[PDB]
Design an enzyme around this catalytic site. Structure first.
Site, PDB file in Angstrom:
ATOM      1  N   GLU A 137     -11.020   8.026  20.027  1.00  0.00           N
ATOM      2  CA  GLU A 137     -10.508   8.148  18.657  1.00  0.00           C
ATOM      3  C   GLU A 137     -10.549   6.749  18.047  1.00  0.00           C
ATOM      4  O   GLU A 137     -11.332   5.921  18.519  1.00  0.00           O
ATOM      5  CB  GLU A 137      -9.113   8.791  18.580  1.00  0.00           C
ATOM      6  CG  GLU A 137      -8.116   8.346  19.620  1.00  0.00           C
ATOM      7  CD  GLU A 137      -7.191   7.276  19.090  1.00  0.00           C
ATOM      8  OE1 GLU A 137      -6.066   7.626  18.671  1.00  0.00           O
ATOM      9  OE2 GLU A 137      -7.577   6.109  19.140  1.00  0.00           O
ATOM     10  N   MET A 138      -9.800   6.514  16.970  1.00  0.00           N
ATOM     11  CA  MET A 138     -10.037   5.271  16.191  1.00  0.00           C
ATOM     12  C   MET A 138      -8.760   4.620  15.741  1.00  0.00           C
ATOM     13  O   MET A 138      -8.766   3.912  14.737  1.00  0.00           O
ATOM     14  CB  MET A 138     -10.910   5.573  14.956  1.00  0.00           C
ATOM     15  CG  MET A 138     -12.281   6.229  15.306  1.00  0.00           C
ATOM     16  SD  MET A 138     -13.370   6.527  13.946  1.00  0.00           S
ATOM     17  CE  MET A 138     -13.672   4.841  13.323  1.00  0.00           C
ATOM     18  N   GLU A 139      -7.669   4.808  16.477  1.00  0.00           N
ATOM     19  CA  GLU A 139      -6.361   4.358  15.985  1.00  0.00           C
ATOM     20  C   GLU A 139      -5.392   3.806  17.009  1.00  0.00           C
ATOM     21  O   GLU A 139      -4.586   2.941  16.691  1.00  0.00           O
ATOM     22  CB  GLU A 139      -5.652   5.508  15.253  1.00  0.00           C
ATOM     23  CG  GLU A 139      -6.235   5.845  13.874  1.00  0.00           C
ATOM     24  CD  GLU A 139      -7.461   6.793  13.923  1.00  0.00           C
ATOM     25  OE1 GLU A 139      -7.697   7.457  14.977  1.00  0.00           O
ATOM     26  OE2 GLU A 139      -8.223   6.810  12.925  1.00  0.00           O
ATOM     27  N   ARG A 194       1.535   9.077  16.296  1.00  0.00           N
ATOM     28  CA  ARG A 194       0.251   9.495  15.751  1.00  0.00           C
ATOM     29  C   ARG A 194       0.015  10.917  16.259  1.00  0.00           C
ATOM     30  O   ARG A 194       0.293  11.222  17.401  1.00  0.00           O
ATOM     31  CB  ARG A 194      -0.884   8.534  16.197  1.00  0.00           C
ATOM     32  CG  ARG A 194      -2.299   9.153  16.126  1.00  0.00           C
ATOM     33  CD  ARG A 194      -3.391   8.047  16.213  1.00  0.00           C
ATOM     34  NE  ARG A 194      -4.638   8.684  16.621  1.00  0.00           N
ATOM     35  CZ  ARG A 194      -5.409   9.438  15.838  1.00  0.00           C
ATOM     36  NH1 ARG A 194      -5.144   9.602  14.540  1.00  0.00           N
ATOM     37  NH2 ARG A 194      -6.496  10.013  16.351  1.00  0.00           N
ATOM     38  N   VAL A 195      -0.434  11.765  15.343  1.00  0.00           N
ATOM     39  CA  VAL A 195      -0.839  13.117  15.650  1.00  0.00           C
ATOM     40  C   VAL A 195      -2.263  13.287  15.141  1.00  0.00           C
ATOM     41  O   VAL A 195      -2.541  13.324  13.944  1.00  0.00           O
ATOM     42  CB  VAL A 195       0.196  14.168  15.091  1.00  0.00           C
ATOM     43  CG1 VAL A 195       1.466  14.199  15.928  1.00  0.00           C
ATOM     44  CG2 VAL A 195       0.508  13.971  13.574  1.00  0.00           C
ATOM     45  N   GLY A 196      -3.215  13.352  16.056  1.00  0.00           N
ATOM     46  CA  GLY A 196      -4.597  13.422  15.614  1.00  0.00           C
ATOM     47  C   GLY A 196      -5.471  14.080  16.641  1.00  0.00           C
ATOM     48  O   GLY A 196      -4.979  14.780  17.505  1.00  0.00           O
ATOM     49  N   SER A 197      -6.768  13.813  16.552  1.00  0.00           N
ATOM     50  CA  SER A 197      -7.724  14.370  17.505  1.00  0.00           C
ATOM     51  C   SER A 197      -8.596  13.291  18.118  1.00  0.00           C
ATOM     52  O   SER A 197      -8.574  12.130  17.683  1.00  0.00           O
ATOM     53  CB  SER A 197      -8.579  15.441  16.823  1.00  0.00           C
ATOM     54  OG  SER A 197      -9.412  14.892  15.833  1.00  0.00           O
ATOM     55  N   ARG A 216      -3.875  16.394   5.789  1.00  0.00           N
ATOM     56  CA  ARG A 216      -3.141  16.925   6.937  1.00  0.00           C
ATOM     57  C   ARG A 216      -1.698  16.493   6.915  1.00  0.00           C
ATOM     58  O   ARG A 216      -0.824  17.218   7.374  1.00  0.00           O
ATOM     59  CB  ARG A 216      -3.796  16.524   8.263  1.00  0.00           C
ATOM     60  CG  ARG A 216      -5.167  17.105   8.399  1.00  0.00           C
ATOM     61  CD  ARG A 216      -5.129  18.599   8.107  1.00  0.00           C
ATOM     62  NE  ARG A 216      -4.865  19.358   9.322  1.00  0.00           N
ATOM     63  CZ  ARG A 216      -4.770  20.682   9.367  1.00  0.00           C
ATOM     64  NH1 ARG A 216      -4.910  21.395   8.257  1.00  0.00           N
ATOM     65  NH2 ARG A 216      -4.542  21.289  10.524  1.00  0.00           N
ATOM     66  N   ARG A 265      -8.922  24.941  17.408  1.00  0.00           N
ATOM     67  CA  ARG A 265      -8.391  23.769  16.716  1.00  0.00           C
ATOM     68  C   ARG A 265      -7.070  24.065  16.016  1.00  0.00           C
ATOM     69  O   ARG A 265      -6.153  23.228  16.017  1.00  0.00           O
ATOM     70  CB  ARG A 265      -9.426  23.189  15.748  1.00  0.00           C
ATOM     71  CG  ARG A 265     -10.595  22.527  16.466  1.00  0.00           C
ATOM     72  CD  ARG A 265     -11.445  21.687  15.505  1.00  0.00           C
ATOM     73  NE  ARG A 265     -11.931  22.471  14.376  1.00  0.00           N
ATOM     74  CZ  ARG A 265     -13.100  23.101  14.346  1.00  0.00           C
ATOM     75  NH1 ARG A 265     -13.916  23.043  15.389  1.00  0.00           N
ATOM     76  NH2 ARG A 265     -13.448  23.793  13.270  1.00  0.00           N
ATOM     77  N   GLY A 317      -4.305  10.971  10.671  1.00  0.00           N
ATOM     78  CA  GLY A 317      -5.291  10.153   9.969  1.00  0.00           C
ATOM     79  C   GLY A 317      -5.602  10.654   8.558  1.00  0.00           C
ATOM     80  O   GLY A 317      -5.838   9.893   7.648  1.00  0.00           O
ATOM     81  N   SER A 351     -11.399  17.426  19.684  1.00  0.00           N
ATOM     82  CA  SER A 351     -12.216  17.847  18.543  1.00  0.00           C
ATOM     83  C   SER A 351     -13.529  18.467  19.038  1.00  0.00           C
ATOM     84  O   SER A 351     -14.083  19.351  18.394  1.00  0.00           O
ATOM     85  CB  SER A 351     -12.541  16.639  17.640  1.00  0.00           C
ATOM     86  OG  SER A 351     -13.338  15.672  18.361  1.00  0.00           O
ATOM     87  N   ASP A 352     -14.026  17.961  20.160  1.00  0.00           N
ATOM     88  CA  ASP A 352     -15.295  18.395  20.760  1.00  0.00           C
ATOM     89  C   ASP A 352     -15.500  17.664  22.071  1.00  0.00           C
ATOM     90  O   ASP A 352     -14.717  16.768  22.416  1.00  0.00           O
ATOM     91  CB  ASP A 352     -16.468  18.088  19.825  1.00  0.00           C
ATOM     92  CG  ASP A 352     -16.878  16.609  19.838  1.00  0.00           C
ATOM     93  OD1 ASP A 352     -16.019  15.724  20.078  1.00  0.00           O
ATOM     94  OD2 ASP A 352     -18.077  16.317  19.589  1.00  0.00           O
ATOM     95  N   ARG A 371      -3.512   5.219  -3.420  1.00  0.00           N
ATOM     96  CA  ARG A 371      -4.829   5.473  -2.799  1.00  0.00           C
ATOM     97  C   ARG A 371      -5.005   6.915  -2.320  1.00  0.00           C
ATOM     98  O   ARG A 371      -5.933   7.226  -1.571  1.00  0.00           O
ATOM     99  CB  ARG A 371      -5.140   4.480  -1.650  1.00  0.00           C
ATOM    100  CG  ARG A 371      -5.508   3.070  -2.083  1.00  0.00           C
ATOM    101  CD  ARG A 371      -5.339   2.079  -0.907  1.00  0.00           C
ATOM    102  NE  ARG A 371      -5.324   0.703  -1.373  1.00  0.00           N
ATOM    103  CZ  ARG A 371      -6.422   0.005  -1.612  1.00  0.00           C
ATOM    104  NH1 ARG A 371      -7.588   0.546  -1.392  1.00  0.00           N
ATOM    105  NH2 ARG A 371      -6.347  -1.240  -2.055  1.00  0.00           N
ATOM    106  N   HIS A 389       0.796  -1.231   0.000  1.00  0.00           N
ATOM    107  CA  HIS A 389       0.000   0.000   0.000  1.00  0.00           C
ATOM    108  C   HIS A 389       0.826   1.276   0.000  1.00  0.00           C
ATOM    109  O   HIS A 389       0.250   2.349   0.057  1.00  0.00           O
ATOM    110  CB  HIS A 389      -1.009   0.030   1.191  1.00  0.00           C
ATOM    111  CG  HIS A 389      -1.938  -1.144   1.220  1.00  0.00           C
ATOM    112  ND1 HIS A 389      -1.577  -2.358   1.763  1.00  0.00           N
ATOM    113  CD2 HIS A 389      -3.217  -1.285   0.798  1.00  0.00           C
ATOM    114  CE1 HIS A 389      -2.592  -3.201   1.659  1.00  0.00           C
ATOM    115  NE2 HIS A 389      -3.608  -2.570   1.098  1.00  0.00           N
TER     116      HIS A 389
END
Ligand SMILES: Nc1nc2c(ncn2COC(CO)CO)c(=O)[nH]1
Ligand SMILES: Nc1nc2c(ncn2COC(CO)CO)c(=O)[nH]1
Ligand SMILES: Nc1nc2c(ncn2COC(CO)CO)c(=O)[nH]1
Ligand SMILES: Nc1nc2c(ncn2COC(CO)CO)c(=O)[nH]1
Ligand SMILES: Nc1nc2c(ncn2COC(CO)CO)c(=O)[nH]1
Ligand SMILES: Nc1nc2c(ncn2COC(CO)CO)c(=O)[nH]1
Ligand SMILES: [Cl-]
Ligand SMILES: [Cl-]
Ligand SMILES: [Cl-]
Ligand SMILES: [Cl-]
Ligand SMILES: [Cl-]
Ligand SMILES: [Cl-]
Ligand SMILES: [Cl-]
Ligand SMILES: [Cl-]
Ligand SMILES: [Cl-]
Ligand SMILES: [Cl-]
Ligand SMILES: [Cl-]
Ligand SMILES: [Cl-]
Ligand SMILES: [Cl-]
Ligand SMILES: [Cl-]
Ligand SMILES: [Cl-]
Ligand SMILES: [Cl-]
Ligand SMILES: [Cl-]
Ligand SMILES: [Cl-]
Ligand SMILES: [Cl-]
Ligand SMILES: [Cl-]
Ligand SMILES: [Cl-]
Ligand SMILES: [Cl-]
Ligand SMILES: [Cl-]
Ligand SMILES: [Cl-]
Ligand SMILES: [Cl-]
Ligand SMILES: [Cl-]
Ligand SMILES: [Cl-]
Ligand SMILES: [Cl-]
Ligand SMILES: [Cl-]
Ligand SMILES: [Cl-]
Lengths: 231, 231, 231, 231, 231, 231
Positions: free
Chosen positions: A177-179, A86-89, A23, A215, A19, A201-202, A42, A3
């Site tokens: 979150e999801m990761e 990982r850098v996310g929210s 970004r 944000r 994610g 994020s909220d 992808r 991938h």
């Protein structure tokens, strides 16, 4: 790898893992010098550049345990990546998690079956690399960036009719979150170092949004902390 | 409370939690001044004394999730205890965990059903209080005590025909004991602060014992670190 | 063995198994002649004496499946113990279980994962040794001690926010304790004979206490029955 | 009821429960006087007659937890049946279970999900009614019928590629059949009395058959014991 | 085979599978020529005859996954049966499933543990043979028989205190019966072709019965469709 | 909606669902007229155009149950989408699945916990909409496109150390992908119509690749079938 369209040595020892691939692009172009895009497969962009004369990569992961697991497995196995950040929210699930707090995840709960598939009756608790986490914590404290260290929940269902976030919050979990469960479990399984740094994020349980301005600020704080976590 | 014979104010804000009540006695008498025994019920001794002019308690927990859960629940609910620090040992499951290393547990895996009873399909990852953990880490580093920060496994079966320690070690887990998941989960559920500090009893997968001398040294190091984790 | 400081032949073929080591002491000193203490490790006392000229041991187990499993495994494997009889109490979960009833457990339900760890999709139903159970039943009936034969529940959490005792009572379960599933499963796995004899500590669902006097009486009845269960 | 064509009072307080409806016919006609067939629905015959001047019914159950659960639920709920005694066979899984032994089941393990559907994380251990079991045991001993009291396994799959009978036998389980868990659980849930009395069909792990003559003898012994279990 | 008294070649390549053996008799005698009964064991009748000059068998299965699994396994393994077509009824769980609809099951959900016993963490979705299903669909459409194609639920408990039919109906499931998961899973495991054709017995969630006349009509429609599904 | 930047009416009643957003672009530009891009959020492109004068949308889903669940939930709930057709690939797990076969999934197995989170002890079998499936089957047969109808497996782990594909193949499952269980379950939960049409990417158990030419051909066949499945 299947991938990722990169060649030998195109990906750095250290990779930041947002994610959203747009970004990833924004991070590399805004923060790094001498940027090359090594992957367009992808549209899940990956880039390598330098920060203060040191090679750093930034690779989009997509959303959810299965998507990040693909990228993390290939980065480790095909490109010998050492540090994965990982850098996310995340959606905050407690009032005491403030909109400006940068979250360092020590561990994550999950409703993914990935670890029950491997361990059956065992509850496997993933674990951040303490060296990365401590460096990030130090970097935040040095500048006065507000930082909160604790656990998160890795969800399979962004829209979950059977959500247990109310009970998770009571047990002290900070946000959803999801990761993270995938990143932490796969990095450790392969003897690599991982950390998740997250903004809010909220507040999911009050519906209360964070503003665009908030944000933007927390995003920059997260990236600054990230670019001081290795070593 | 049902299992602790103490009166109001007899137990300090901070309690050390060895598994063996005879070690609780040894700790209080060796390290603390002005010691009173507040509990003799079931011979599971608890003591309160001072360390550098500050009240500290030491309470035996017994072995296994169910036993420690009784004491931790009563300490929190009946005596308003704020900081709960397990001081014990674990069987190391990796060669890189050295016999002299003091282990600070960020989290723990388990084969206890306690969290599946509460959460069902969710894998709940317990989480150490980062403030306690960081203070302990700092105290070790200040003196040059070797310290390793990572995860442990909380076992229900000391003698387990179906042990998964080989796979757990591959996922980076450091050692096996019988308490941490309960301490961490129950403290967090009640908004209190917990940490487990552990010495190495042996290497389980090589059978290789630690010597009496090594055990004495690491025990003292663990207690010294413990008596610098609050604040 | 790891947790018991006894030598060869110091422990009898038949061992009574109270949870509280101070009750082990009380039983041996009150009921047996020529008593020696063979174990002081962790203050979990074990004693051997004679009853009517026959060697009998009494060994504290601690609370919960993990603690009793340690002692039961070591008694069987290191000391070749043949008959293992828990003598303890349980919280009654039905009105028809009277405060004076001595309970003989044919089997036990549990929320421990110990048997799912071994059997996965199988629900393993532990089973008392019928010879021991029948002898105990006969001994009670001979003297007119009220006796009730049925099932119990082996709990991991004395304080359980997710308790199913209401439904268990509807399915006929008599009372809740924290040991039987382990004793019965481990004894059978090793071809030894086990039985749990239990008094009522309270009615959990009415909060209604048993009095000190009632508890003293039922305790003596339980021990008298126990000292007639082998053969 | 949905599956039984009987009228009020046609079914006795006590019902014997063979799996095969042609065996129900054989039992009623061979052992009872003044026999009426009260049910022909699905050819799952049920009969009522007298034994020594007392009304007794005999109802085929079919094979497997779902089939027996239908009949047991309807017998209890629609016909107010008090005593339910399965009379059947099982495949012996231990050498020490002899071809001539009549088995009284104290409890049963299972791979049916019926109790996890109700209890989730709890392992529910079904329990025979001790009064029925003791009467049956006494009746066997009085005549010198060899009797073995212990546990059985209730299987969903007569042909099971994933069978755990080898491990079950090591834990002391005597034999495998397809009904007991349902009978015991449903009777207890409704405050009725149940017992399973079983003969040996073969040794499953040696393939070694029982002979027609042996089977005839043990069948008659089982029925004789059954016709002395109430009271 | 253990449960079927037939000889070589007595059972056809194609077998219809009603649950009730008296319905097996009714089908063979009403629809087929030159009928022989090849099985009377347990009164679970099986018959072979011809339909339009082609050999067809009809074998009762009994009720529930364990019972049908016995017959299906023996038909496949001992008699080399190729096409297995259940003809039965189900309780409709949706208003849009009309009393006259003939249901072709593409797949089935279940609360049986049979597939978790084999697959553990995997949810195995059984699958009808599309060739049989399409032939049946074509046969219904050709004549104007109303037909609905979708999923069913295979229940272990006809009387289920913990039924999830309300939620299953919301996810689109059409009706509840007690066989399909076993038929579909076992046929596929052995490379044979299976299909379940079902009529509506009632609407379970409205209690609303189907009339005797409606049931007679739909039964005949089901059998007519069945006798046109092979090829 | 949170992840899709489209306005009211910008998305058609019918949406094709490739995993790769660059394939979504390729499909819309190659097959449709008058194409607009309605979504660029996260680079997960969605497009709407016409095919033979009828509005059709094409929306990338990303990889894995969590990612597709986000898009499917938002398409249904915010844009009122009626027909949802995944067009993707899978790794064939059987020799009889040929490299040129177009697969229509009737159902899917999974190791995702998504349905156990909702249903607990129930195995939920997702179900394709038969109308869509039959139209697709008819369209393939009309042109002579080879088509195979059966089940697939929805995997969370592209790289799975604990893969059960060998056993799944024995039970007749055709191939492995990472989406179908979510699409089918969520569409049905909301009363919408779903179908997955899949090409073969490789034979996973022989490592044997499909060639670029084969993949191009099967891709075009899949899209042609897709553009004839509604109605
Ligand atoms: N489940 C969940 N995830 C959140 C939330 N907020 C931020 N994330 C993380 O972003 C998602 C994609 O929207 C994972 O990549 C939230 O409230 N709930
Ligand atoms: N299961 C396990 N536990 C260990 C080990 N070493 C030290 N502990 C912790 O001590 C036990 C009691 O012996 C728990 O209180 C070990 O090797 N295995
Ligand atoms: N869980 C539970 N256990 C009970 C109870 N009463 C008596 N016991 C048994 O004693 C315990 C320790 O207090 C196990 O050794 C009760 O009400 N609930
Ligand atoms: N699973 C199993 N069941 C057995 C066996 N022997 C006797 N039975 C009980 O009879 C069955 C039907 O054949 C249940 O009614 C055996 O070996 N295995
Ligand atoms: N669980 C269930 N099963 C049903 C129903 N209706 C028809 N069947 C199928 O018939 C049963 C036996 O009564 C299985 O063979 C129903 O409402 N619920
Ligand atoms: N797990 C798995 N998935 C496959 C395979 N081939 C094609 N897919 C489907 O594509 C994936 C992403 O690579 C899901 O979108 C395979 O061999 N294994
Ligand atoms: Cl590329
Ligand atoms: Cl560098
Ligand atoms: Cl994110
Ligand atoms: Cl959630
Ligand atoms: Cl909740
Ligand atoms: Cl005291
Ligand atoms: Cl103080
Ligand atoms: Cl310890
Ligand atoms: Cl272990
Ligand atoms: Cl292992
Ligand atoms: Cl000692
Ligand atoms: Cl002696
Ligand atoms: Cl006790
Ligand atoms: Cl409980
Ligand atoms: Cl309850
Ligand atoms: Cl009748
Ligand atoms: Cl009578
Ligand atoms: Cl039987
Ligand atoms: Cl079995
Ligand atoms: Cl086994
Ligand atoms: Cl026959
Ligand atoms: Cl023919
Ligand atoms: Cl039916
Ligand atoms: Cl149901
Ligand atoms: Cl429901
Ligand atoms: Cl957009
Ligand atoms: Cl249109
Ligand atoms: Cl795909
Ligand atoms: Cl897989
Ligand atoms: Cl496999």
């Amino acid at each position: 790898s299947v991938h990722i369209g990169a060649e030998k040595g195109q990906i750095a020892d250290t990779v930041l893992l947002p994610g959203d691939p747009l970004r990833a692009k924004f991070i590399a172009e805004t923060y790094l010098e001498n940027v090359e895009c090594y992957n367009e497969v992808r549209g899940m962009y990956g880039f390598t550049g330098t920060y203060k004369g040191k090679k750093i990569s930034v690779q989009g992961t997509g959303m959810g345990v299965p998507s990040i697991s693909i990228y993390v497995n290939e980065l480790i196995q095909s490109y010998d990546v050492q540090n994965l950040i990982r850098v996310g929210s995340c959606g905050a699930i407690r009032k005491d998690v403030k909109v400006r707090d940068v979250i360092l995840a020590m561990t994550s709960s999950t409703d993914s079956q990935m670890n029950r598939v491997a361990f059956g009756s065992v509850d496997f608790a993933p674990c951040a690399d303490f060296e990365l986490l401590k460096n990030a914590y130090d970097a935040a404290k040095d500048k006065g960036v507000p930082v909160t260290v604790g656990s998160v929940f890795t969800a399979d269902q962004f829209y979950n009719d059977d959500s247990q976030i109310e009970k998770l919050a009571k047990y002290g979990v900070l946000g959803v979150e999801m990761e993270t469960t995938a990143l932490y479990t796969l990095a450790a399984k392969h003897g690599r170092k991982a950390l998740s740094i997250l903004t809010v994020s909220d507040h999911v349980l009050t519906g209360e949004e964070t503003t665009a301005e908030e944000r933007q600020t927390t995003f920059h704080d997260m990236i600054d902390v990230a670019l001081h976590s290795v070593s």
